[PDB]
PDB file of C-alpha atoms in Angstrom:
ATOM      1  CA  UNK A  14      -0.013   0.011  -0.030  1.00 44.57           C
ATOM      2  CA  UNK A  15       2.846   2.431   1.055  1.00 45.42           C
ATOM      3  CA  UNK A  16       4.887   1.435  -2.129  1.00 44.33           C
ATOM      4  CA  UNK A  17       2.268   2.286  -4.816  1.00 42.74           C
ATOM      5  CA  UNK A  18       0.974   5.181  -2.608  1.00 40.81           C
ATOM      6  CA  UNK A  19      -2.712   4.365  -1.544  1.00 40.75           C
ATOM      7  CA  UNK A  20      -4.304   4.904   1.877  1.00 40.00           C
ATOM      8  CA  UNK A  21      -6.959   2.617   3.457  1.00 37.80           C
ATOM      9  CA  UNK A  22      -9.317   5.553   3.096  1.00 38.06           C
ATOM     10  CA  UNK A  23      -8.662   5.886  -0.605  1.00 41.96           C
ATOM     11  CA  UNK A  24      -9.242   2.132  -1.249  1.00 40.71           C
ATOM     12  CA  UNK A  25     -12.435   2.565   0.823  1.00 42.93           C
ATOM     13  CA  UNK A  26     -13.957   5.552  -1.254  1.00 43.80           C
ATOM     14  CA  UNK A  27     -13.025   3.464  -4.423  1.00 41.64           C
ATOM     15  CA  UNK A  28     -15.001   0.557  -3.328  1.00 42.96           C
ATOM     16  CA  UNK A  29     -17.654   2.935  -2.116  1.00 43.90           C
ATOM     17  CA  UNK A  30     -18.339   5.284  -5.054  1.00 42.90           C
ATOM     18  CA  UNK A  31     -16.236   4.044  -8.044  1.00 45.33           C
ATOM     19  CA  UNK A  32     -17.554   0.553  -7.574  1.00 41.92           C
ATOM     20  CA  UNK A  33     -14.118  -1.196  -7.674  1.00 38.76           C
ATOM     21  CA  UNK A  34     -13.572  -3.954  -5.025  1.00 39.21           C
ATOM     22  CA  UNK A  35     -10.277  -3.810  -3.189  1.00 37.28           C
ATOM     23  CA  UNK A  36     -11.226  -6.781  -0.752  1.00 33.78           C
ATOM     24  CA  UNK A  37      -9.867  -9.823  -2.491  1.00 33.06           C
ATOM     25  CA  UNK A  38      -6.260 -11.033  -2.563  1.00 32.26           C
ATOM     26  CA  UNK A  39      -3.847  -8.793  -4.305  1.00 31.20           C
ATOM     27  CA  UNK A  40      -0.443  -9.901  -5.685  1.00 30.07           C
ATOM     28  CA  UNK A  41       1.913  -7.660  -7.878  1.00 29.26           C
ATOM     29  CA  UNK A  42       0.415  -8.752 -11.250  1.00 27.31           C
ATOM     30  CA  UNK A  43      -3.140  -8.487 -10.200  1.00 26.71           C
ATOM     31  CA  UNK A  44      -2.345  -4.971  -8.688  1.00 24.80           C
ATOM     32  CA  UNK A  45      -0.817  -4.202 -11.985  1.00 31.26           C
ATOM     33  CA  UNK A  46      -3.949  -5.124 -14.149  1.00 32.73           C
ATOM     34  CA  UNK A  47      -6.212  -3.405 -11.470  1.00 32.69           C
ATOM     35  CA  UNK A  48      -4.187  -0.163 -11.753  1.00 34.61           C
ATOM     36  CA  UNK A  49      -4.485  -0.045 -15.547  1.00 34.38           C
ATOM     37  CA  UNK A  50      -8.203  -0.887 -15.317  1.00 34.99           C
ATOM     38  CA  UNK A  51      -8.928   1.507 -12.270  1.00 36.66           C
ATOM     39  CA  UNK A  52      -7.049   4.263 -14.120  1.00 36.06           C
ATOM     40  CA  UNK A  53      -8.906   3.702 -17.258  1.00 36.62           C
ATOM     41  CA  UNK A  54     -12.133   3.648 -15.396  1.00 34.79           C
ATOM     42  CA  UNK A  55     -11.362   7.307 -14.301  1.00 35.55           C
ATOM     43  CA  UNK A  56     -11.018   8.418 -18.156  1.00 34.73           C
ATOM     44  CA  UNK A  57     -14.363   6.669 -18.723  1.00 34.35           C
ATOM     45  CA  UNK A  58     -15.620   8.808 -15.799  1.00 34.01           C
ATOM     46  CA  UNK A  59     -14.010  11.848 -17.575  1.00 33.29           C
ATOM     47  CA  UNK A  60     -16.092  11.288 -20.645  1.00 34.08           C
ATOM     48  CA  UNK A  61     -19.525  11.019 -18.654  1.00 36.19           C
ATOM     49  CA  UNK A  62     -18.572  14.182 -16.645  1.00 37.65           C
ATOM     50  CA  UNK A  63     -17.669  16.270 -19.679  1.00 34.84           C
ATOM     51  CA  UNK A  64     -21.297  15.516 -20.869  1.00 35.23           C
ATOM     52  CA  UNK A  65     -22.614  17.263 -17.597  1.00 33.66           C
ATOM     53  CA  UNK A  66     -20.288  20.173 -18.534  1.00 34.63           C
ATOM     54  CA  UNK A  67     -22.556  21.447 -21.428  1.00 33.70           C
ATOM     55  CA  UNK A  68     -21.545  25.086 -20.987  1.00 37.78           C
ATOM     56  CA  UNK A  69     -18.598  26.543 -22.911  1.00 37.29           C
ATOM     57  CA  UNK A  70     -15.733  26.557 -20.345  1.00 37.96           C
ATOM     58  CA  UNK A  71     -13.306  24.754 -22.676  1.00 35.17           C
ATOM     59  CA  UNK A  72      -9.734  26.241 -22.837  1.00 36.09           C
ATOM     60  CA  UNK A  73      -8.141  23.689 -25.108  1.00 35.72           C
ATOM     61  CA  UNK A  74      -8.708  19.970 -25.954  1.00 37.90           C
ATOM     62  CA  UNK A  75      -7.098  17.305 -28.059  1.00 34.17           C
ATOM     63  CA  UNK A  76      -8.068  17.366 -31.859  1.00 32.55           C
ATOM     64  CA  UNK A  77      -5.741  15.764 -34.468  1.00 31.73           C
ATOM     65  CA  UNK A  78      -2.969  18.166 -35.575  1.00 29.57           C
ATOM     66  CA  UNK A  79      -1.442  19.431 -32.338  1.00 27.10           C
ATOM     67  CA  UNK A  80      -0.404  15.997 -31.038  1.00 25.12           C
ATOM     68  CA  UNK A  81       2.372  15.401 -28.414  1.00 23.59           C
TER      69      UNK A  81
ATOM     70  CA  UNK B   2     -23.817  16.719   7.414  1.00 26.37           C
ATOM     71  CA  UNK B   3     -20.226  17.897   8.381  1.00 26.80           C
ATOM     72  CA  UNK B   4     -17.688  20.265   6.648  1.00 30.57           C
ATOM     73  CA  UNK B   5     -14.470  18.450   7.637  1.00 29.29           C
ATOM     74  CA  UNK B   6     -15.932  15.075   6.693  1.00 28.98           C
ATOM     75  CA  UNK B   7     -16.756  16.477   3.212  1.00 28.51           C
ATOM     76  CA  UNK B   8     -13.247  18.074   3.002  1.00 27.70           C
ATOM     77  CA  UNK B   9     -11.761  14.461   4.034  1.00 29.51           C
ATOM     78  CA  UNK B  10     -13.835  12.905   1.200  1.00 29.78           C
ATOM     79  CA  UNK B  11     -12.974  15.531  -1.457  1.00 28.54           C
ATOM     80  CA  UNK B  12      -9.156  15.166  -0.673  1.00 26.23           C
ATOM     81  CA  UNK B  13      -9.376  11.329  -0.533  1.00 27.88           C
ATOM     82  CA  UNK B  14     -11.321  11.276  -4.036  1.00 29.15           C
ATOM     83  CA  UNK B  15      -8.823  13.828  -5.396  1.00 32.47           C
ATOM     84  CA  UNK B  16      -5.641  12.075  -4.130  1.00 30.68           C
ATOM     85  CA  UNK B  17      -6.732   9.122  -6.352  1.00 31.83           C
ATOM     86  CA  UNK B  18      -6.923  11.639  -9.394  1.00 32.62           C
ATOM     87  CA  UNK B  19      -3.565  13.027  -8.709  1.00 32.37           C
ATOM     88  CA  UNK B  20      -1.612   9.667  -8.601  1.00 33.30           C
ATOM     89  CA  UNK B  21      -3.746   7.444 -10.953  1.00 31.87           C
ATOM     90  CA  UNK B  22      -4.489   9.713 -13.957  1.00 33.28           C
ATOM     91  CA  UNK B  23      -2.205  12.644 -12.923  1.00 33.47           C
ATOM     92  CA  UNK B  24      -1.819  16.073 -14.306  1.00 31.16           C
ATOM     93  CA  UNK B  25      -4.093  15.595 -17.461  1.00 34.77           C
ATOM     94  CA  UNK B  26      -7.601  15.750 -15.949  1.00 32.30           C
ATOM     95  CA  UNK B  27      -6.494  17.699 -12.817  1.00 32.46           C
ATOM     96  CA  UNK B  28      -5.375  20.577 -15.118  1.00 30.39           C
ATOM     97  CA  UNK B  29      -8.680  21.740 -16.605  1.00 32.46           C
ATOM     98  CA  UNK B  30     -10.518  23.676 -13.930  1.00 35.08           C
ATOM     99  CA  UNK B  31     -13.956  22.767 -15.040  1.00 33.05           C
ATOM    100  CA  UNK B  32     -13.164  19.016 -15.476  1.00 28.81           C
ATOM    101  CA  UNK B  33     -11.546  18.611 -12.163  1.00 30.19           C
ATOM    102  CA  UNK B  34     -14.579  19.989 -10.043  1.00 28.98           C
ATOM    103  CA  UNK B  35     -16.982  18.118 -12.592  1.00 29.38           C
ATOM    104  CA  UNK B  36     -15.254  14.891 -11.484  1.00 28.93           C
ATOM    105  CA  UNK B  37     -16.369  15.595  -7.899  1.00 27.33           C
ATOM    106  CA  UNK B  38     -19.864  16.464  -8.847  1.00 27.59           C
ATOM    107  CA  UNK B  39     -20.220  13.376 -11.127  1.00 28.16           C
ATOM    108  CA  UNK B  40     -20.424  11.179  -7.976  1.00 26.47           C
ATOM    109  CA  UNK B  41     -22.610  13.723  -6.175  1.00 26.14           C
ATOM    110  CA  UNK B  42     -20.666  14.601  -2.976  1.00 23.92           C
ATOM    111  CA  UNK B  43     -23.014  17.424  -1.837  1.00 25.00           C
ATOM    112  CA  UNK B  44     -22.872  19.779   1.211  1.00 21.95           C
ATOM    113  CA  UNK B  45     -25.726  21.751   2.799  1.00 24.14           C
ATOM    114  CA  UNK B  46     -27.919  20.598  -0.179  1.00 26.36           C
ATOM    115  CA  UNK B  47     -25.653  22.247  -2.725  1.00 25.43           C
ATOM    116  CA  UNK B  48     -23.497  20.640  -5.350  1.00 24.50           C
ATOM    117  CA  UNK B  49     -20.126  22.191  -5.220  1.00 24.76           C
ATOM    118  CA  UNK B  50     -19.597  24.981  -7.768  1.00 28.00           C
ATOM    119  CA  UNK B  51     -16.319  27.166  -7.725  1.00 29.55           C
ATOM    120  CA  UNK B  52     -17.685  29.272  -4.785  1.00 30.81           C
ATOM    121  CA  UNK B  53     -18.694  26.347  -2.502  1.00 30.40           C
ATOM    122  CA  UNK B  54     -15.681  24.077  -3.681  1.00 30.83           C
ATOM    123  CA  UNK B  55     -13.022  26.370  -2.513  1.00 32.95           C
ATOM    124  CA  UNK B  56     -15.113  27.796   0.493  1.00 33.27           C
ATOM    125  CA  UNK B  57     -15.253  24.509   2.386  1.00 35.62           C
ATOM    126  CA  UNK B  58     -11.354  24.266   2.300  1.00 34.21           C
ATOM    127  CA  UNK B  59     -10.954  28.047   2.815  1.00 30.10           C
ATOM    128  CA  UNK B  60     -13.685  28.395   5.469  1.00 28.58           C
ATOM    129  CA  UNK B  61     -12.289  25.504   7.491  1.00 26.96           C
ATOM    130  CA  UNK B  62     -11.154  25.357  11.148  1.00 26.43           C
ATOM    131  CA  UNK B  63      -7.213  25.908  11.243  1.00 27.16           C
ATOM    132  CA  UNK B  64      -6.782  22.954  13.695  1.00 25.10           C
ATOM    133  CA  UNK B  65      -8.709  20.599  11.305  1.00 25.45           C
ATOM    134  CA  UNK B  66      -7.018  22.019   8.228  1.00 26.57           C
ATOM    135  CA  UNK B  67      -3.601  21.524   9.906  1.00 28.63           C
ATOM    136  CA  UNK B  68      -4.673  17.879  10.894  1.00 29.06           C
ATOM    137  CA  UNK B  69      -4.962  17.138   7.134  1.00 29.67           C
ATOM    138  CA  UNK B  70      -1.527  18.982   6.425  1.00 30.27           C
ATOM    139  CA  UNK B  71      -0.075  16.792   9.228  1.00 33.61           C
ATOM    140  CA  UNK B  72      -1.472  13.370   8.490  1.00 36.32           C
ATOM    141  CA  UNK B  73      -1.934  13.410   4.636  1.00 36.63           C
ATOM    142  CA  UNK B  74       1.505  14.673   3.751  1.00 39.31           C
ATOM    143  CA  UNK B  75       1.441  14.208  -0.033  1.00 36.85           C
ATOM    144  CA  UNK B  76      -2.343  13.809  -0.387  1.00 38.06           C
ATOM    145  CA  UNK B  77      -3.506  17.088   1.178  1.00 38.69           C
ATOM    146  CA  UNK B  78      -0.398  19.115  -0.111  1.00 38.06           C
ATOM    147  CA  UNK B  79      -1.318  17.557  -3.636  1.00 41.67           C
ATOM    148  CA  UNK B  80      -4.763  19.070  -3.774  1.00 38.75           C
ATOM    149  CA  UNK B  81      -3.694  22.347  -1.912  1.00 38.23           C
ATOM    150  CA  UNK B  82      -0.860  23.203  -4.306  1.00 37.26           C
ATOM    151  CA  UNK B  83      -2.943  22.514  -7.319  1.00 39.02           C
ATOM    152  CA  UNK B  84      -6.079  24.459  -6.033  1.00 37.72           C
ATOM    153  CA  UNK B  85      -4.247  27.617  -5.219  1.00 41.50           C
ATOM    154  CA  UNK B  86      -2.122  27.275  -8.463  1.00 41.65           C
ATOM    155  CA  UNK B  87      -5.195  26.519 -10.855  1.00 39.09           C
ATOM    156  CA  UNK B  88      -8.488  27.620  -9.375  1.00 40.82           C
ATOM    157  CA  UNK B  89      -9.074  31.420  -9.338  1.00 35.39           C
ATOM    158  CA  UNK B  90     -12.395  33.215  -8.964  1.00 34.47           C
TER     159      UNK B  90
END
């Protein structure tokens, strides 16, 4: 927990609000796929939240031509 | 119910943002506060717009503010430095 950085409180709000169950056995590789998946779940949240933000408060966003 | 419980919630749910997906979604002022409103963490019946969002951290008891500074070293300072840097009036 200390290594990857997450507090007991943070794992609890995840399995409260975000729906992701930290409660099973966690080894290295499962922790790996779960971090991937949990992070990706936030960019799926992003999508759904930027539909509630209907009003024009957009500074800049990712089209095609200005790529990193 | 309580102000500091809600502040504790917000800092918990944001600390997550900060270390998982990082400076990408945190950046955009609207997107950040919209992530908190998505899951409906409400206070005094009100969903936290930029007034109410900063005011629960700003109008906070010095001792309970410092408690967060104290215990949540990187987590509190994380949201702190980003909110005073990004979020104006």
